[PDB]
């Protein structure tokens, strides 16, 4: 099965993902799909996008990153932006549209020089910079 390998955005099955993964009977490359029906174009052009067509790369600051990485440089699991536990903060999606603050995805909503970071799931460490390679590297 193949839904595991998809960036799923809720509120917006395995057969669909499988037939999208093989590109079986498809006149194009299947970049995204809805649960089903497929597209040769993603949101960058329940929604599920192929992580192959989600740039796992950034330029300098990386303000337009949208990957699914959710680990810190220290290797700590990021805390969901919806959660205030362990750490409370003012980073609601309503305050930040299109910056894509869902689940525990590494992000850099304000173009920090650090690059994208996350709130750790470790109470003692509030926030840490996720280790993400640039394309140029």
């Amino acid at each position, epitope marked *: 099965n193949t839904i595991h390998e998809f960036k799923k955005s809720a509120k917006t099955a395995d057969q669909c993902a499988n037939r999208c993964t093989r590109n079986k009977g498809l006149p194009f490359t299947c970049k995204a799909f809805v649960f089903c029906l497929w597209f040769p174009f993603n949101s960058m052009s329940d929604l599920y996008e192929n992580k192959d067509y989600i740039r796992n790369c950034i330029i300098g600051k990386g303000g337009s990153y949208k990957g699914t990485v959710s680990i810190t440089k220290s290797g700590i699991k990021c805390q969901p932006w919806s959660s*205030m*536990i*362990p*750490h*409370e*903060h*003012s980073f*609601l999606p309503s*305050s930040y549209r299109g910056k894509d603050l869902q689940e525990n995805y590494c992000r850099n909503p*304000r173009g920090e020089e650090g690059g994208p970071w996350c709130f750790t799931s470790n*109470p*003692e460490v*509030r*926030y840490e910079v996720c280790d993400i390679p640039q394309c140029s590297e």
Partner: antibody, heavy 116, light 109 residues
């Protein structure tokens, strides 16, 4: 050695205005909620306002909302509680605190006395 | 607005004894509750956050539980130093943040 230190607490006449300052040492701002919490002599704690350093967004308690306002200088790791139209009910020790629901860090507090 | 009713006013116990303190809310809060300790001349100390999450450095004898509108705080093995006033607090990004009236804890001796 992450610290919060309050200053500005003094004796004021009723109806006058006063500015308290909290300065943080040994940590990034950053990234945090800064709340003020006061405590009248022999009474309990009363939260009165917060600001998000990054957001700049402020929220004040009803007992205070009309007349108090909170600002910051992130570069200097400083928060300003700016009080107006002080009444006797405002007499309390004022705490600069790190957080809104989870307050890991507290200042020792600065004592404001509204009197003639 | 939001009312946090904290009962009782005061509780007593001897060393090793156990004490339980209640906090009840006018509205639901959904595990957004915190417990603080304060001794005179000092600022409060954070004990519990979430409803159950124990702040680092704090003895395991302190127990937080509850959800919706019903919350409890139980100090199980009680030392002399536990003599303080303890407060329930709920804080949310918005709107607001509010404390309880507090509860005084005496050590029977």
């Amino acid at each position: 050695q992450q610290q919060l230190v309050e200053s500005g607490g003094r004796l004021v006449n009723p109806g006058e205005s006063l500015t308290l300052t909290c300065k943080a040492s040994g940590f990034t701002f950053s990234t945090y909620y800064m709340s003020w919490v006061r405590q009248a002599p022999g009474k309990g704690l009363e939260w009165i306002g917060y600001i998000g350093t990054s957001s700049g967004t402020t929220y004040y308690a009803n007992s205070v909302k009309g007349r108090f306002t909170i600002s910051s200088d992130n570069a200097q790791n400083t928060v300003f509680l700016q009080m107006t139209s002080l009444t006797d009910s405002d007499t309390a020790t004022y705490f600069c605190a790190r957080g809104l629901g989870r307050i890991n860090l507290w200042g020792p507090g600065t004592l404001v006395t509204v009197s003639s | 607005e939001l009312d946090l009713t904290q009962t009782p006013s005061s509780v007593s116990a001897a060393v090793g004894g156990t004490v339980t303190i209640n906090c009840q809310a006018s509205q639901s809060v959904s595990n957004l509750l915190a417990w603080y300790q304060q001794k005179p001349g000092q600022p409060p100390k954070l004990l519990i956050y979430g409803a159950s999450n124990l702040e680092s450095g704090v003895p395991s004898r302190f127990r937080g539980s509850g959800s919706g509108t019903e919350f409890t705080l139980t100090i199980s093995g009680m030392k002399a130093e536990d003599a303080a006033t303890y407060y329930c607090q709920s804080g949310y990004y918005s709107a607001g943040a509010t404390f309880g009236a507090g509860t005084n804890v005496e050590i029977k001796r």
